[PDB]
Amino acid sequence: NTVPFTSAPIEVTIGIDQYSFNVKENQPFHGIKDIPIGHVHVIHFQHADNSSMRYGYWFDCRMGNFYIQYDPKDGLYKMMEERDGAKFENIRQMMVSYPKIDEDDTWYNLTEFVQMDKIRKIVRKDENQFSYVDSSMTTVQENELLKSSLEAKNEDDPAHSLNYTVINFKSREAIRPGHEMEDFLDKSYYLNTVMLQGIFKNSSNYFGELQFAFLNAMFFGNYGSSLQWHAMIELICSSATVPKHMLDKLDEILYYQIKTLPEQYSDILLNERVWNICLYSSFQKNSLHNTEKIMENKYPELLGKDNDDALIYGDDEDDEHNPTIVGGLYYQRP
Amino acid sequence: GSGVMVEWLESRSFSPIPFPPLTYKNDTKILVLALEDLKDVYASKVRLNASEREELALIEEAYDNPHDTLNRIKKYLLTQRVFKPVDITPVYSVDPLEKITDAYLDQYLWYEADQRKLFPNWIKPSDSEIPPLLVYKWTQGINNLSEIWDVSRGQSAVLLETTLGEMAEKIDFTLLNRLLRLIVDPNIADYITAKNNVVINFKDMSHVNKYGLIRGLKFASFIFQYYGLVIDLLLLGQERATDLAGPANNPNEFMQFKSKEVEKAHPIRLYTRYLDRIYMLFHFEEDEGEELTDEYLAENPDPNFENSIGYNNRKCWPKDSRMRLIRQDVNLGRAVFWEIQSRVPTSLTSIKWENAFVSVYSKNNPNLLFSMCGFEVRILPRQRMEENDEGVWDLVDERTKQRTAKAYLKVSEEEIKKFDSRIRGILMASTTFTKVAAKWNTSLISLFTYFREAIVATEPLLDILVKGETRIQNRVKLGLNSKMPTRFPPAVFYTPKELGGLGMISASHILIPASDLSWSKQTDTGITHFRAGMTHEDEKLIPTIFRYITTWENEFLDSQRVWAEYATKRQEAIQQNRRLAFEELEGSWDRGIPRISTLFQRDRHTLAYDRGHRIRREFKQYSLERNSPFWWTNSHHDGKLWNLNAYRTDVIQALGGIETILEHTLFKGTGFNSWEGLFWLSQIPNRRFTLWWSPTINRANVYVGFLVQLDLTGIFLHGKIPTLKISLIQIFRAHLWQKIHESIVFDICQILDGELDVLQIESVTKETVHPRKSYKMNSSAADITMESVHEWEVSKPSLLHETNDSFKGLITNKMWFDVQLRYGDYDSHDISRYVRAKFLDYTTDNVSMYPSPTGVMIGIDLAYNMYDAYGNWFNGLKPLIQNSMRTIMKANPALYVLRERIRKGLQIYQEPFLNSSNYAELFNNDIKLFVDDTNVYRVTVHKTFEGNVATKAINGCIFTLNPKTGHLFLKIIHTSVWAGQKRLSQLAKWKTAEEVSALVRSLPKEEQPKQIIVTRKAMLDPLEVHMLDFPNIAIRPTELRLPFSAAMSIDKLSDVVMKATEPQMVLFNIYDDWLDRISSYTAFSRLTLLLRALKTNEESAKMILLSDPTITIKSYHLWPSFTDEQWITIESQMRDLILTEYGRKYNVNISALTQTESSKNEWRKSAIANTLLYLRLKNIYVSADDFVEEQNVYVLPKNLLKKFIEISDVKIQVAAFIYGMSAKDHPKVKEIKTVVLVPQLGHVGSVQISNIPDIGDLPDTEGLELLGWIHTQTEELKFMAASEVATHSKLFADKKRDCIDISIFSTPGSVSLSAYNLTDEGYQWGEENKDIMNVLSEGFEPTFSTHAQLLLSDRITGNFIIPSGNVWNYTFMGTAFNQEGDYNFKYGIPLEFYNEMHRPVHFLQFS
């Protein structure tokens, strides 16, 4: 299946899924065809004039006939659905063919659990069957916390908020009264009862939101998405009680995410604290075999695995995670 | 070979090294050295790999079980002759367990061989000196050779330098075993030769090592140097080797001879071998030279005069300065080498003309040349000056004390290339900017700290340094932007890491441009600027490393001086029967090589047994793949030989100080006013570095040709700088720019509506604006419009803070406000200039529609957190807008959001920390509690000599304090809380959190805190979690180090804690009733001062509080009822105490007022002090060494030690006899059952004890052995003092010599117990030297006393015997005391030193 472009008024780097290419002002680019019909997809944009953010549209070719059109008024490329079937079918070799599937089956592995109908609940815009995301969009969680922490109320567009599941480790939702220490140190209740059983119903829906967070983080450099992705990883790793199939499936999921992550975005994406905790101290520190290996390979510096530089300039304060030593008896050389 | 060694070793009477005995005195120490060396490798690294960890765990086991390991090891030396295979990569990995026996053997051999003088003075490296110092010694030694520079009679000097080719590689094992058996036990020999004869695995091939030393074995150094000695002996012959070494009963120092005639008796004046590099300095008279040459030319004719061809010379020197190839000198050089080469079988080593340099000094050759340890050296004698200031050594004739020669130094070509490849390697890697900087730094420092003054003379190296530094910069720049910058601020490179810079160290000429030296500060009263043009000082360069490292010459001259001084000071102290105190050397501590500081390190008595330590460090290259670049110095032996702290200080200052540096960063954007030093071998991620420095990197002076404005903001981007756009997008997410604008305008509207009347305002209208208006950067419109009741008389336009307006400018009835936001960069962020220009531009705009000719443009720079305003004012308006902007800038919640997101992006890190800055709020009306959890989980510790640590928990408490009211909620945590629980240090935090939230619950809404401030950061999560039902209570951390932990030094608090038998809440006012007379603020400063003192020196602080016993503590109080006048004194005393103790630790005297956090017989003083002695019992150190079951073990009951210390004195020695008996069926275990307090007259450094008490009449005294005596002292010694010996002998010489001396070093904080036996020589000297009062005296020897084995135990208890009169302390009854007295005794309770029985009565006030 096929997404035509009406034209290409302005110079822009275009991405589809994990692919990318440049289009020049008024290049005769008439879109993309032979798009693999199975998956969700994302077609995204960064204008050569460095003034723009990254933006994009998630869609599913099975849900309709979709095409891209520049809107000079708004100054961006817009997805649209061709309502009139015959009208579309009318709308040669500058229609480029989507590539043959790599040996990895990379995109499926990144989007295995991602579903358009799930996307559409996180990005809320009813009139459309495709979903618009960009770099600047905040989360419903952040928007809530703001007003919580806090004349003209005049709303923000709800479609410009990412309605990710609210995950907050220091919340009443996460911590049962009378089980404060238990629930904070072992997040199994929050994961299994509140999240998996309560909200997501199953591990497929969990993984979908996790995979979608990641990809919005990667494609758009969206802050709330990188946060959500880390928080959903940390929630599993911080639970002593997790279904076996989730742990095995997570290892693979993360492996592919870290494999596909371009070096040049890793700084911004990866959270040093979360990755060190999950891998080396959490309940699930032994459980992510393949992810540990690829991370230690691509990003040792992040994990303190860069195996030794000279103290230049030549202090100590007392330690919280030991007892306070009142006194002692010490046998030793004088 | 071997014939030479036999003749040599017999000539030396060499005493073969035995197999290590079962009870080898040092075996212990030898083992720790070996294992410490083995661990060392893991000191650096945090996350271990598997085998790294597995290896480490092996060593620790070995360490944790010493004597087992010793017996394993000696077993394998005795019997093991087949071994695991060795992996190589050349670096050798040897089976971890083998390495233990091997490193143990290494140490044993080097120690014993050093003791036995196996290796003569010429063999290097020597523990004696670092390599640069060898080179120096060698050049001085040459200069000091008798007549060496004389060419009157056609003399010649010849310096031959070459390599013993393949020395290690051709070692023959059968020969090696034979050789070893001359010097070591034959079983050690067999071990050694067998251990070389093992399988080596490389790639896929393995092969049995048939010959060749394996350099990676830990004792390879020993072999290599022993073998080298064989070759030295061939080169030198027995006689000359004997001249050089000196007689084995009186050996020569390196290069020294017994007389001048022996020096001159042989042409070989000097010899040295550094591993496989030999140096030979010959001297010839004209005849001997020609003789030798003719003999050579006979074998090897050179008719055509070709001998200059292929004659190695030193290219690093100018042509005139290198050796001149004059035919006579060239033939002498070749003849000397020919002679030398002939002396050594090629089966031992390959000596080739091609790898030799032969420098000839003569009437035709004024320079003597050599290369050593990386240095090219050229000696020019003054007399030859006719024949000059960089990298030069002055060579002084020791006899005339005149400078007779200069040594010129350069860094060798080889070492220049090595450094060049290190830098090229950095650039050529797989990295964070900081990591690249840190590698540059390591390489630079490694180069400079070694080669020092040689560098400045080496122009090709200066060039490489400069080019290398530029390439490091260029790498950072290319990472920052394809485009590459017009110019670049040096602040980003050379600012230290603590301030977020790369902390590069420079070796280059770098201008700091004046334009980079501007900074500004916003105050309440206005904006202050600094620019370079304002001062008349020097133009600023980045400091370079050149001038921060003391030259080797100055180190060495100063070392000679401070070590002579030390010897002299030590002599002088010994002359007064004293030991030299370290305080007398304070001031030469960081001088000397070794550093004088080494004399007083704790590990010193053990390092004494670490021999071969230099070569051992150098050979690590063969057995570890990554080693320190500082392979040539060892800080345990050498001390620290550089210190670059002044560099950091100077770079900061040159860059314009903190203030200037931070103006280049996003620091002001965070909304912090003051620097405090808090970001986090850890790197700054490139993203973060980029963001932090963005104001100075992302500006038009750095990048041009690509200027755009970022959608949804007014931020400009001056190129595609990696990561920055996204960082900034994230910061301003969800239309924050527009929201800040709207939010600020809303605030101003609110304020205006509160002033309708006061300012005759009719109405205030909030305009509605285009969506993007807040970030239309080239036109504007009004945001607020304002209607006059009647009329306004307004000024012509002026700035917000200009003070002197004239309101005669215009009449108006409509005033507008335009709130402008900008995001400034380093080039342009002057908000005053900006708002004036924008106002004057926009108001004469034909596109900005303002609704009247009169109004005010307000401006806020979001990047620099500064503001101003310009336009028309009427009376009252300017001060209102002043106050309003002051409050808006602090409080606006959208600005708050901006600053948090900036702080997040920078990983600064959240409720606001408590701070000096906001400290004062503690005393507003907002109710607040401090929580300190430090004393919640407390233990006492038992550590045995092994390393086993048992803790036991004692009662603790939660310290929760209202700093405004002084109310202290002290929750007692009884030990039962911990019973059966695990992970106690984590549980402690949650238990604290639970107990605090319960306290808050128990208070009525009235009194519930608004904030809880936790002293320790690990309390944050647990308390936030436990306070979820109280969302309006903020939990705050603090950076302040508050001294609440010292609360348990307040007796009345200790007492209730220690007495509690269940959980309990006790309420206190920690301010007593101070608030009747003083403020909360003042009470808290006083509390904090008092607790700081108690924390810093409990004893002194409690002395201060206890001085006047007339001033008491009310029953419902914690502190004494001082007057105001007395509190002033007390306070000042504690200020002093703190800083005394601070100068007594950091060595400082008196400095800048920045702040932090009748006569005779005053026995009364010491009597109060003595009531504090019990505190010292909290840390008890017992002198201990490896259990020997052959020896007695003496067991002192805890209860007797307790009582002994309680009754003792802070200054005066107190003594008693100990009695006991061997346990049942345990002859070796001698239990102390009774202490006998005996009449005595004590002194500071001694005690007159009366004689062995006759106690035969008392019951239970059947059985009781006299065991010896026990006493306090105030000096810490590793031996029995001369005075102890004198006293011990007097007591025991004629009666029971096996009596021990238990000496207790009593000091604030602790007691240290040492038990000793006294030798018969000990006893002899004591007889000769009666009534000795000093630590030393003529004849005295530490070795008079030997370590006795002492245990404490609380399983047994003792009792006391006392004089029947109860009195024992005769200080105040001297005349009544008779030391030869025959006293009587009874069981009882010894009075304390200054009990009333012992001292003058004190008149009190008839209550």
Swiss-Prot record, chain A:
The modification Phosphotyrosine is found at residue 313. Transmembrane segments: none annotated. Keywords: Cytoplasm, mRNA processing, mRNA splicing, Nucleus, Phosphoprotein. The modification Phosphoserine is found at residue 239. It comes from the Eukaryota. GO terms for cellular component: cytoplasm; U5 snRNP. Changing residue 239 to D/E: Disrupts interaction with PRP8. Residues 315-334 are annotated as: Disordered. Residues 247-268 are annotated as: Leucine-zipper. Gene3D superfamilies: 2.60.34.20, Aar2, C-terminal domain-like. Phosphorylated on serine and tyrosine residues. Signal peptide: none annotated. Disulfide bonds: none annotated. InterPro entries: AAR2, AAR2_C, AAR2_C_sf, Aar2_N, AAR2_N_sf. It is found in: Cytoplasm; Nucleus. One of its GO terms (biological process) is spliceosomal snRNP assembly. Its main location: cytoplasm. Changing residue 239 to A: No effect on interaction with PRP8. The modification Phosphothreonine is found at residues 260, 324. Belongs to the AAR2 family. Heterodimer. Interacts with PRP8 (via RNase H homology domain and MPN domain), competing with BRR2 for the same binding site. Component of a U5 snRNP complex that contains at least the U5 snRNA, PRP8, SNU114, AAR2, SMB1, SMD1, SMD2, SMD3, SME1, SMX2 and SMX3, but is not a component of the U4/U6-U5 tri-snRNP complex. Component of the U5 snRNP complex that is required for spliceosome assembly and for pre-mRNA splicing. Involved in splicing pre-mRNA of the A1 cistron and other genes that are important for cell growth. Present with 7330 molecules/cell in log phase SD medium. This is A1 cistron-splicing factor AAR2. It comes from Saccharomyces cerevisiae (strain ATCC 204508 / S288c) (Baker's yeast). The gene is AAR2.
Swiss-Prot record, chain B:
Its main location: nucleus. It comes from the Eukaryota. The keyword RNA-binding applies. GO terms for biological process: generation of catalytic spliceosome for second transesterification step; mRNA 3'-splice site recognition; mRNA 5'-splice site recognition; mRNA splicing, via spliceosome; spliceosomal snRNP assembly; spliceosomal tri-snRNP complex assembly. Keywords: mRNA processing, mRNA splicing, Nucleus, Ribonucleoprotein, RNA-binding, Spliceosome. GO terms for molecular function: metallopeptidase activity; mRNA binding; pre-mRNA intronic binding; U1 snRNA binding; U2 snRNA binding; U5 snRNA binding; U6 snRNA binding. Changing residue 932 to A: Alters protein folding. Severely impaired growth. Strongly reduced growth at 35 degrees Celsius. GO terms for cellular component: catalytic step 2 spliceosome; cytoplasm; nucleus; Prp19 complex; spliceosomal complex; U4/U6 x U5 tri-snRNP complex; U5 snRNP. Changing residue 933 to N: Reduced growth at 30 degrees Celsius. Strongly reduced growth at 16 degrees Celsius. Residues 481-732 are annotated as: Linker. It is found in: Nucleus. Changing residue 767 to Q: No effect on viability. Residues 4-480 are annotated as: Reverse transcriptase homology domain. Residues 1193-1322 form the MPN domain. Residues 918-1157 are annotated as: RNase H homology domain. Residues 736-907 are annotated as: Restriction endonuclease homology domain. Functions as a scaffold that mediates the ordered assembly of spliceosomal proteins and snRNAs. Required for association of BRR2 with the spliceosomal U5 snRNP, and the subsequent assembly of the U4/U6-U5 tri-snRNP complex. Functions as a scaffold that positions spliceosomal U2, U5 and U6 snRNAs at splice sites on pre-mRNA substrates, so that splicing can occur. Interacts with both the 5' and the 3' splice site, as well as the branch region. Has a role in branch site-3' splice site selection. Associates with the branch site-3' splice 3'-exon region. Also has a role in cell cycle. The MPN (JAB/Mov34) domain has structural similarity with deubiquitinating enzymes, but lacks the residues that would bind the catalytic metal ion. Present with 468 molecules/cell in log phase SD medium. Component of the U4/U6-U5 tri-snRNP complex composed of the U4, U6 and U5 snRNAs and at least PRP3, PRP4, PRP6, PRP8, PRP18, PRP31, PRP38, SNU13, SNU23, SNU66, SNU114, SPP381, SMB1, SMD1, SMD2, SMD3, SMX2, SMX3, LSM2, LSM3, LSM4, LSM5, LSM6, LSM7, LSM8, BRR2 and DIB1. This is Pre-mRNA-splicing factor 8. It comes from Saccharomyces cerevisiae (strain ATCC 204508 / S288c) (Baker's yeast). The lineage of its organism: Eukaryota, Fungi, Dikarya, Ascomycota, Saccharomycotina. The gene is PRP8. The chain holds residues 885 to 2396 of 2413 of the full protein.
